[PDB]
Amino acid sequence: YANVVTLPNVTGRVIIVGDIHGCRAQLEDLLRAVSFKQGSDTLVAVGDLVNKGPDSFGVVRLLKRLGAYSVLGNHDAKLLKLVKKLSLAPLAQSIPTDVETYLSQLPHIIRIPAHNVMVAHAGLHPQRPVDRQYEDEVTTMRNLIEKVTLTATEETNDGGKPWASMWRGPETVVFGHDARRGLQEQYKPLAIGLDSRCVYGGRLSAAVFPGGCIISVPGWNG
């Protein structure tokens, strides 16, 4: 099943950021926008650190030097897949060892119990145990269709409802992935969708804990 990492000792301030997609400049602005204090705050990404943006490599190296955490996104996953096969193609041919190593160690889910939060790239199946989730679902789901009784799907043309509307907690699940829907806040405090489309010219948003307040900055203009 999907790999889970638990951080019981993280009781300080926690910053969770949406899809970065190589928008390093934007990430720097967001860090200044929340007054990030290295050594004090803990940073956690929702995945999709690469592709589309101007600097995929810088994004990953910045997070590395900062000691930042991140779950695995589906673009990160597809890149690793393409690479192991000794526009992800151009990226696969140019990916350096360190970057590849950082991505290769990312879990699918991160639990931050002190703040009653759970991070996954796309979402969690509301009918499966946290430790018994599936990789394809946790990194690509957008919808849930009634048919153990719900089917998770990345497509939106087969009906169903947005997965987050079906989440019941008790944990607050923070995610990204679904740029088509933008920032999702109507399910607070049980869930928070942070993919505000930074790389598409929207915004780069973050959820701050304790509190669960959303702080964002302008996205990449292209």
Binding site feature residues for Mn(2+): 19, 21, 48, 74, 121, 177
Is the backbone of residue 118 left (phi > 0), alpha (psi -120 to 50) or beta? beta
Strands across the sheet containing 213-218: 69-70, 42-45, 14-17, 203-209, 213-218
203 sits near Mn ion (criterion: CB under 5 A): no
Binding residues are 19, 21, 48, 74, 121, 177
Angle at the Cα of 120 from the Cα atoms of 75 and 203, rounded to 5 degrees: 65
The piece of 33-41, 55-63, 159-167, 172-180 that touches Mn ion (CB under 5 A) is 172-180
Among 115, 125, 142, 177, binds Mn ion (CB under 5 A): 177
Rounded Cα distance, 2 and 8, in Å:
19
171 sits near Mn ion (criterion: CB under 5 A): no
In the bound state with Mn ion, the residue whose beta carbon lies nearer, of 19 and 137, is 19
Angle at the Cα of 92 from the Cα atoms of 88 and 97, rounded to 5 degrees: 140
Residues 73-132 that bind Mn ion (CB under 5 A): 74
Give how far the C-alpha of residue 64 lies from the chain's centroid of Cα atoms, to the nearest Å: 16
Give how far the C-alpha of residue 7 lies from the chain's centroid of Cα atoms, to the nearest Å: 17
Among 4, 15, 18, 19, binds Mn ion (CB under 5 A): 19
The piece of 1-9, 31-39, 53-61, 67-75 that touches Mn ion (CB under 5 A) is 67-75
Looking at residue 202, the DSSP 8-state letter turns out to be S
In the bound state with Mn ion, the residue whose beta carbon lies nearer, of 128 and 181, is 181
178 sits near Mn ion (criterion: CB under 5 A): no
In the bound state with Mn ion, the residue whose beta carbon lies nearer, of 115 and 177, is 177
52 sits near Mn ion (criterion: CB under 5 A): no
Say how many C-beta atoms besides its own lie within 10 A of residue 87's C-beta: 7
Distances (CA, A) of 20 to 49, 80, 108, 162: 5, 17, 17, 22
In the bound state with Mn ion, the residue whose beta carbon lies nearer, of 160 and 202, is 202
Number of residues that bind Mn ion (CB under 5 A): 4
Least distance to Mn ion, CB of residue 180, Å: 10
Interface positions with Mn ion (CB under 5 A): 19, 48, 74, 177
